[PDB]
A paper describes a structure:
We describe here the use of an artificial cofactor employing the well‐known biotin‐[name] system to catalyze a Baylis‐Hillman reaction. As protein host, we chose [name], as it can be easily crystallized and thereby supports the design process. There are several examples using [name] as the host for these cofactors, since its natural ligand biotin binds strongly (K d∼10−15 M) and is easy to modify with catalysts at the carboxylic acid group. No enzyme is known to naturally catalyze the Baylis‐Hillman reaction, a very versatile and atom‐economic C−C bond forming reaction for the production of various functionalized compounds and intermediates of active pharmaceutical ingredients (APIs).
We chose a derivative of DMAP as the artificial cofactor due to its low steric demand, which will facilitate its inclusion into the protein scaffold. The protein host around the cofactor was rationally designed on the basis of high‐resolution crystal structures obtained after each variation of the amino acid sequence. The location of the catalyst is in a shallow cavity at the surface of the protein. The system was evolved through repeated cycles of mutagenesis, activity tests, and structure determination. According to the presented structures and calculations the catalytically active site is too shallow to undergo interactions with 1.
Residue numbers in the entry:
A (entry chain B), D (entry chain B): 13 to 136
B (entry chain A), C (entry chain A): 15 to 136
């Protein structure tokens, strides 16, 4: 739901995902990474299913951060693909792809893959 | 920036995108494959000040597979880079997540790769 | 080497493995999820002379989901590393490919992640 | 089939995949990468579906290379997951994960993802 997704979320790295789920299916907000070549907040934008199934499945969504802000540029971008699962212990379960700029010859080695689990309470 | 325009991948899907001065990607995506018909909204981000050393321009975008005609309860993100030159291309790898229960969540994401060029695959 | 033994992931699957002197991984895998029953053969490889700087030990293995009882026309590879210490773990990400026609090949691979420890998830 | 898979294959990077598909579902052979921190041949081992479906689908398979041989050790391993599709232009279509040794704190950034298409004739 709009209400369930909008707010502040934290992953296992301690990063802070601040998002608003708009009525039109848009995700907007800011991302602060606790890891990598990043400082302070970055713009994010994405999309979510604004009319999810009523069978107990999660709500599919994704978003992108390009790692450039007013302070620095790490010539890279991450996309997160996953779903919101509501309930007592709400979660956004994601897989991500982090691509960094590379020459054509080195393009084969230009994308990391990983996974982040977002919860409403900070871990550890 | 080279990114703005109409692009096609190897499946024949149509990616119509505008790269704005604020680092945003906006536009529409029409998939030639899967549980999809007509155009879907996309939004993303790109590096608006890329390196000048021959590296590509990092970018990503998302489509949620709901429009006025269909809802496939799923979303794809593409992560990759624009490479300019004689034959400009956008090389991507993608993640397609479909809604699932928590118990079936382990099997909820496909991975793949799409290469986009400006040549209509007529 | 620490790798030889019985490991369990967060799904409750059972990975019984031997890390041999020649860099090979051999053993059996029992999945607690999906189109799978009983044990399946696995084979893989690991770095038999890892760095001494605190880095983990890189490794990977494959299961094809055919045994004497079932054939799910699919295979999973796990890629990751062993990290030793008080609570040894094997952190992995995996790719599960299922047989498909060429036309449906774009939608033929799931991606996920499994973390293995030696604690029976009783 | 055993006959279709066994032999020498080439990917778009110019790497050489030499494999034997055994009756027991085993893949064995050697891999020579044209890219990255690699020289000469490396041992590979994997598995394939030795009784695939008869409906026109491909044959699921995977294999692993640890990037250590008699000459060097790059403290890393790649797995390829994919399928053999037989016919006039036989192919092995794969996705891969390349993991390199990392400390626990840097484990989030320890795996590259990519894709290789193997054919019976060298490209370009
Ligand atoms: O580190 C960042 C930007 C921050 C990413 C933070 C990541 S997003 C997924 C995960 N979840 C989080 O919450 N945080 C992390 N970008 C790089 C990566 C590697 N780079 C190269 C360059 C050249 N060769 C190899 C690698 C340089 C720039
Ligand atoms: O097909 C789509 C939406 C269109 C995706 C098009 C894809 S995007 C990457 C690729 N590049 C393109 O240009 N086109 C393709 N969504 C399905 C996925 C599978 N779904 C399930 C549900 C339950 N269990 C298993 C699978 C149901 C929803
Ligand atoms: O379920 C299995 C085999 C068991 C996989 C167990 C997985 S391995 C990674 C994870 N870690 C574990 O410990 N366990 C799970 N194979 C299916 C996959 C989906 N299949 C299709 C076919 C056609 N269209 C779509 C999907 C049919 C075959
Ligand atoms: O390059 C190789 C080994 C050869 C891989 C060849 C790859 S297999 C998939 C693709 N298909 C091929 O045919 N060939 C390529 N291994 C590394 C990678 C990155 N490494 C680090 C270390 C520390 N921080 C970051 C990165 C160091 C060791």
């Amino acid at each position: 739901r709009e209400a369930g997704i909008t707010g502040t979320w934290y992953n296992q790295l301690g990063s802070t995902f601040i998002v608003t789920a708009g009525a039109d299916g848009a995700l907007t907000g800011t991302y602060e990474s606790a890891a990598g070549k990043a400082e302070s907040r970055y713009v994010l934008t994405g999309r979510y299913d604004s009319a999810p199934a009523t069978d107990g499945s999660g709500t599919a969504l994704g978003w992108t951060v390009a790692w450039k802000n007013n302070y620095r540029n790490a010539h890279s971008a991450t996309t997160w693909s996953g779903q919101y699962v509501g309930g007592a212990e709400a979660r956004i379960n994601t897989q991500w792809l982090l691509t960094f700029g590379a020459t054509e010859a080195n393009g084969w080695a230009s994308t990391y893959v990983g996974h982040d689990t977002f919860t409403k309470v900070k871990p550890s």
